[PDB]
């Protein structure tokens, strides 16, 4: 394989991964991030992945080792480790498909990661239901 539309395999898999991070999105999503869905005009899916990929980088780099998401139990420690891994995979694949270099994320106020991930699942599914025809 080689001739095709990079979107059916790499992206459908990137969708199930986007839903995997939606499992623990209540205690770790209480950390305001940037809202990249306030002004979408000429931005396509690839541009929205490189931007959301930069914000996803700060999520797995800083919160990956923050007592905030940790909690105070040994069980939440093993579960948290699984969240950081699923993130690394979506940080290289989400924008890896975009094929971009710099992505100055900046037009956005302090939104809550709860509504951010919410719009991430809605955009991935709704727009990928027509990726292939």
CATH topology for the 1-133 domain: Growth Hormone; Chain: A; (1.20.1250)
Per-residue DSSP letter, 29 = S
The torsion region of residue 35 among left (phi > 0), alpha (psi -120 to 50) and beta comes to beta
The CB density around residue 50, as the number of other CB atoms within 10 Å, is 20
CA torsion 103→81→62→11, rounded to 10°?
Answer: 10
| Distance of alpha carbon 74 from alpha carbon 125, whole angstroms | 34
What are the residue boundaries of the structural domains of the chain, listed by start? 1-133
List for the chain the helix, strand, coil content (%; round to 5): 55, 5, 40
Solving technique: NMR
**Do 39 and 111 contact (CB within 8 A), yes or no?**
no
Residue-by-residue DSSP string for 115-127? HHHHHHHHHHHHH
Q: How far is CA 126 from CA 46, 57, 109, 110, in A?
A: 15, 24, 25, 25
């Amino acid at each position: 394989e080689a001739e095709a539309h990079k979107c059916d395999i790499t992206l459908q898999e990137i969708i199930k991964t986007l839903n995997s991070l939606t499992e623990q999105k209540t205690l770790c999503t209480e950390l305001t991030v940037t809202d990249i869905f306030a002004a979408s005009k000429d931005t396509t899916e690839k541009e929205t992945f490189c931007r959301a990929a930069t914000v996803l980088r700060q999520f797995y780099s800083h919160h990956e080792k923050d007592t905030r998401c940790l909690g105070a139990t040994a069980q939440q420690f093993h579960r948290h480790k699984q969240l950081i891994r699923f993130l690394k995979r979506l940080d290289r694949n989400l924008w890896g498909l975009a094929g971009l270099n710099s992505c100055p994320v900046k037009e956005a106020d302090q939104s809550t990661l709860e509504n951010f991930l919410e719009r991430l699942k809605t955009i991935m599914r709704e727009k990928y239901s027509k990726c292939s025809s």
